[PDB]
Structure formats: structure tokens, C-alpha cells
Amino acid sequence: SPTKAIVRLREHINLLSKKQSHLRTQITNQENEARIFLTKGNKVMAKNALKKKKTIEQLLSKVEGTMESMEQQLFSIESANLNLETMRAMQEGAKAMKTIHS
């Protein structure tokens, strides 16, 4: 069923949002790692921590983009069902008109 499809897509999105929080946390930690090296005076390792920061940012973008795709499919399914309900509403309106003419 399309309802189940929506639940399953949301299920994966929820798991991806856990990855989102995890990777976002790592990005903050990599920034902090770099700041620690800057206070130590080791700019080489600070830049390397920023390289790791950017690496995780790329992974976060992948997770966020994956959720976007699932949401597009999810909302497309929802919209399809809303269009079927709009259709049924118009069909009942037509029935009312049939009664008026009859």
C-alpha cells in the first residue's frame, strides 16, 4: 500500500536523520580538533583536522541528499493520494449536480 510506502520511506529517513546528527556532531568535533591544534601551534595538524572536517561534511551532504530523495518520493505518494481525494470530492460534487439536473 502507498501508506506503507510512506511509513517505510519515513523509517529510513529517521535512521538517516540519526546519521545526520552523528555526522554533524563529528563536524563540530573536527572543528574543535583543529582549534586545539591552533592553540598548540601546530597549523599542519589543524589543517589536517579541517580536511577531516570537510570529509565528514561531504558525508553529511550525502545523507541529507538521500533523505531529500526519499522525501520527494514520500510526498509524491502523499500528493497522489490527496489528488485521489480531490477527485472523489469532485465526483461527489458531480453527483450533487446530477441530482440538481434530475
Short mmCIF file of C-alpha atoms in Angstrom, two decimals:
data_model
loop_
_atom_site.label_atom_id
_atom_site.label_comp_id
_atom_site.label_asym_id
_atom_site.label_seq_id
_atom_site.Cartn_x
_atom_site.Cartn_y
_atom_site.Cartn_z
CA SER A 1 0.00 0.00 0.00
CA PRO A 2 1.07 3.62 -0.54
CA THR A 3 0.59 4.24 3.20
CA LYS A 4 3.17 1.54 3.97
CA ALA A 5 5.48 3.01 1.34
CA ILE A 6 5.28 6.33 3.16
CA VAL A 7 5.93 4.66 6.54
CA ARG A 8 8.94 2.75 5.13
CA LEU A 9 10.45 5.83 3.49
CA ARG A 10 9.98 7.75 6.75
CA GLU A 11 11.59 4.86 8.65
CA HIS A 12 14.73 5.15 6.51
CA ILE A 13 14.66 8.95 6.76
CA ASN A 14 14.52 8.70 10.57
CA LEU A 15 17.57 6.42 10.52
CA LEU A 16 19.30 8.83 8.16
CA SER A 17 18.45 11.72 10.48
CA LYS A 18 20.29 9.77 13.18
CA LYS A 19 23.29 9.63 10.82
CA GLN A 20 22.73 13.37 10.20
CA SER A 21 23.05 14.20 13.91
CA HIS A 22 26.04 11.88 14.26
CA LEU A 23 27.96 13.32 11.30
CA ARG A 24 27.03 16.90 12.26
CA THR A 25 28.40 16.20 15.73
CA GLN A 26 31.63 14.90 14.15
CA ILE A 27 31.93 18.08 12.09
CA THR A 28 31.83 20.15 15.31
CA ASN A 29 34.38 17.77 16.86
CA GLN A 30 36.73 18.12 13.87
CA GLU A 31 36.48 21.92 14.14
CA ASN A 32 37.39 21.61 17.84
CA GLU A 33 40.26 19.29 16.98
CA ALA A 34 41.62 21.90 14.60
CA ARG A 35 41.15 24.65 17.23
CA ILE A 36 43.08 22.55 19.73
CA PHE A 37 45.99 22.27 17.29
CA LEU A 38 45.81 26.02 16.66
CA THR A 39 46.18 26.72 20.36
CA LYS A 40 49.07 24.21 20.38
CA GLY A 41 50.56 25.98 17.37
CA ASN A 42 50.51 23.03 15.00
CA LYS A 43 48.80 24.52 11.95
CA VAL A 44 49.69 21.49 9.84
CA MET A 45 47.63 19.18 12.02
CA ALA A 46 44.94 21.86 12.36
CA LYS A 47 44.61 21.90 8.55
CA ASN A 48 44.52 18.10 8.56
CA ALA A 49 41.69 18.20 11.11
CA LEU A 50 39.90 20.66 8.79
CA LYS A 51 40.46 18.18 5.93
CA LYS A 52 38.67 15.60 8.08
CA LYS A 53 36.00 18.20 8.93
CA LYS A 54 35.33 18.71 5.20
CA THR A 55 35.38 14.94 4.65
CA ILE A 56 32.55 14.50 7.14
CA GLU A 57 30.71 17.48 5.63
CA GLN A 58 30.72 15.65 2.31
CA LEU A 59 29.30 12.53 4.01
CA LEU A 60 26.63 14.65 5.76
CA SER A 61 25.65 16.15 2.39
CA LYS A 62 25.21 12.60 1.06
CA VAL A 63 22.94 11.66 3.97
CA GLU A 64 20.90 14.86 3.62
CA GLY A 65 20.57 14.37 -0.14
CA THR A 66 19.44 10.76 0.41
CA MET A 67 16.71 11.96 2.77
CA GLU A 68 15.68 14.58 0.21
CA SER A 69 15.16 11.87 -2.45
CA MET A 70 13.11 9.77 -0.03
CA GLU A 71 11.03 12.80 1.00
CA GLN A 72 10.37 13.64 -2.69
CA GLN A 73 9.08 10.11 -3.27
CA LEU A 74 7.20 10.14 0.03
CA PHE A 75 5.49 13.49 -0.70
CA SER A 76 4.77 12.40 -4.26
CA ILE A 77 2.90 9.39 -2.87
CA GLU A 78 1.04 11.57 -0.35
CA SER A 79 0.20 14.10 -3.07
CA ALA A 80 -1.10 11.30 -5.31
CA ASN A 81 -3.46 10.22 -2.53
CA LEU A 82 -4.55 13.82 -1.93
CA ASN A 83 -5.28 14.13 -5.65
CA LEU A 84 -7.40 10.94 -5.44
CA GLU A 85 -9.32 12.50 -2.54
CA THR A 86 -9.73 15.75 -4.52
CA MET A 87 -11.03 13.63 -7.40
CA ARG A 88 -13.54 11.88 -5.09
CA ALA A 89 -14.64 15.29 -3.80
CA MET A 90 -15.26 16.42 -7.37
CA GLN A 91 -17.10 13.18 -8.06
CA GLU A 92 -19.46 13.86 -5.14
CA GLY A 93 -19.94 17.41 -6.45
CA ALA A 94 -20.85 15.91 -9.82
CA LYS A 95 -23.36 13.65 -8.05
CA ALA A 96 -24.94 16.75 -6.49
CA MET A 97 -25.20 18.32 -9.95
CA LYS A 98 -26.76 15.13 -11.29
CA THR A 99 -29.39 15.43 -8.54
CA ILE A 100 -29.97 19.09 -9.43
CA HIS A 101 -30.49 18.24 -13.10
CA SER A 102 -32.56 15.17 -12.28
#
